[PDB]
Amino acid sequence: DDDFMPLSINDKTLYEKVLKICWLYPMTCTLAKKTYSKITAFLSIFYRHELHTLNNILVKTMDDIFNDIVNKKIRSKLESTSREEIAQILVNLDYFIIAAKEFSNFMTRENILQNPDMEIRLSSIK
Amino acid sequence: LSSNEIVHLKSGTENMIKLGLPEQALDLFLQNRSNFIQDLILQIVDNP
Amino acid sequence: KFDETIDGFKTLKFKLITILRFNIRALCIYDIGSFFQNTKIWNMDVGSIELDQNIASLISELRRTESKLKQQLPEKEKNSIFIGLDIVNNYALIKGA
Numbered sequence: 001d002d003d004f005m006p007l008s009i010n011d012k013t014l015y016e017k018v019l020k021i022c023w024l025y026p027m028t029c030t031l032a033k034k035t036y037s038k039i040t041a042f043l044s045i046f047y048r049h050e051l052h053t054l055n056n057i058l059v060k061t062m063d064d065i066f067n068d069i070v071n072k073k074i075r076s077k078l079e080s081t082s083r084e085e086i087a088q089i090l091v092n093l094d095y096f097i098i099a100a101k102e103f104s105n106f107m108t109r110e111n112i113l114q115n116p117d118m119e120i121r122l123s124s125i126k
Numbered sequence: 127l128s129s130n131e132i133v134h135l136k137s138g139t140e141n142m143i144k145l146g147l148p149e150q151a152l153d154l155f156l157q158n159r160s161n162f163i164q165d166l167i168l169q170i171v172d173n174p
Numbered sequence: 175k176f177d178e179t180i181d182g183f184k185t186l187k188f189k190l191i192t193i194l195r196f197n198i199r200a201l202c203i204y205d206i207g208s209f210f211q212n213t214k215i216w217n218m219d220v221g222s223i224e225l226d227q228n229i230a231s232l233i234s235e236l237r238r239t240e241s242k243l244k245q246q247l248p249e250k251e252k253n254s255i256f257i258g259l260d261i262v263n264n265y266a267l268i269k270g271a
Contacts, residue, residue, distance in 0.1 A: 051169065056227040115224035115225055170237070171233075
């Protein structure tokens, strides 16, 4: 999907749905929010693999399966040398880096909630 | 003093009453639920 | 009968000795969760939350081990072996740790 333009302000129907997508620029943060929210939403395949050490290092397996550990986003966007929304698409990757901060804010995580003392993710965000 | 279920526990409980040893019967029953809850605690502090 | 009950006493000290060595070596075993703890960090790794899962395993089978050990045997020996071997191996466990 292409024509790297700004976000067309429809003024105003899905702007609240854009605000849920915000957790502008045309598509990348606009669709990829549904992609990753769909991903970690789909990655809640537990609530039946519980009463064991799944709460252990399988949590770290969920850590390695990041917002697919962001090189998957940060290869093709790293590869795409194109003047169309150059750094404006990446304004939704500085702003999807604010969604990387939303991902390390998507941090009421597991073990059911313990220890709530750190859940940071910013290696691939770095 | 051995069954984690209900039906033998229910049954032989009222059979023990059917002998007429009800006080010992109840005390053993409460002991079974004591050991029951006791061992139910054996599945896990992880955080408080 | 003094050689006899003497020998039974020797089996008692051997057996309770073996139990105390079992719990203590379960602990010193369990401290090797730090070996490796996957590069206990340099100056920070912040964050830095929690909690070295092998140590939670140590707490777990320690807890159930004391549960069943309190179930079968008598109290005073359990308090003895568990008390001395647990606290001492905790301390020197931190020392070599």
